[PDB]
């Protein structure tokens with residue numbers, strides 16, 4: 001066992017030295033995650049083995065095949081990240097068309113408009129927390145409107161969602177899930193009581209009524225859960241980590257400002273360097289198998305370090321150098337394989353628009369002190385707060 005809680009807050013703040021320590025000793029290792037989680041299992045820290053692990057049919061995401069149960073599954077229902085083919089294939093079909101880049105570009109003007117408004121409000125203040133004034137409100141606004149639930153309670157949803165994704169206590173975690181399941185049941189019933197609506201959630205409602213076996217009521221609830229929660233807690237961090245990383249590497253920021261053409265690739269290099277999802281979600285071995293010649297037992301949990309893979313020097317030369325010209329085409333920030341992030345085109349767009357607009361409208365943007373508290377859970381990378389001035 002390697003208890004990662006033993007490295008304390010240093011690891012929370014900067015995990016990469018430890019991932020490097022481990023990657024030198026091999027591609028995979030049995031570990032205990034830090035508190036409060038304290039989860040035991042195989043952690044994959046090399047790129048090639050991480051990548052292959054992400055595409056491996058021997059790793060199930062569905063704990064109920066082993067009689068195991070979790071709060072998400074029982075209270076929200078089955079959603080994409082906790083199902084294997086063929087069920088996965090069904091559910092993903094329902095939504096995949098909605099999230100291609102071509103389709104998602106239809107939202108650009110609204111995204112640009114939300115971005116302009118938030119900037120209009122923030123800029124006169126001369127300084128702000130980037131997170132509250134900008135990075136948080138943009139994603140949430142966009143995903144609610146695409147879902148067709150524009151009028152939701154942001155503040156409450158964010159608090160419920162905050163707990164769910166980075167939990168503090170086990171009772172507060174349970175509390176969050178019950179309340180969010182109830183809130184989502186209610187929002188689904190609201191949509192059912194209105195005239196038919198041309199948005200994603202409306203489309204899902206209709207699909208279930210046309211054929212119960214294509215989509216159960218449980219799965220309908222759980223889809224809305226995952227789209228809303230991924231839809232915000234995570235693009236927020238990409239934007240925030242983007243700004244933070246640019247403003248702490250002012251030569252890259254200068255190079256970008258000199259050629260704004262470099263933006264899309266800059267965003268990719270942030271995905272590599274400080275990817276918001278640090279470790280991938282739940283997998284276990286469906287059968288006995290091996291990762292780079294280490295024996296893994298049937299039922300063993302496998303955690304794939306996406307960000308550790310991003311800093312593997314075997315894949316990414318000078319891995320700790322943030323270089324916007326690298327424009328890395330092969331990072332695992334969005335996963336790999338059949339579960340490859342559904343939202344990747346949308347998240348890219350949002351961050352693209354946010355960063356360009358923020359940069360063009362704040363030419364002397366600068367960090368206004370150290371950033372706020374990092375969430376515990378080495379499942380997420382980001383900061384609760386980012387004070388900036390301009």
Ligand code: HEM
Nearest residue numbers: 080081230231234235238280281334335339341342343347
């Ligand atoms: C910077 C932003 C984001 C990052 C870094 C990210 C990352 C990921 C990763 C790594 C996975 C795969 C995890 C695994 O295999 O265990 C994934 C899956 C997914 N993401 Fe995202 N995500 C982002 C934004 C979004 C957004 C905006 C949505 C909005 C709809 C979304 C929806 C999903 C869904 C539905 C899946 C499940 C796909 C499947 O299971 O087939 N994500 N995401």
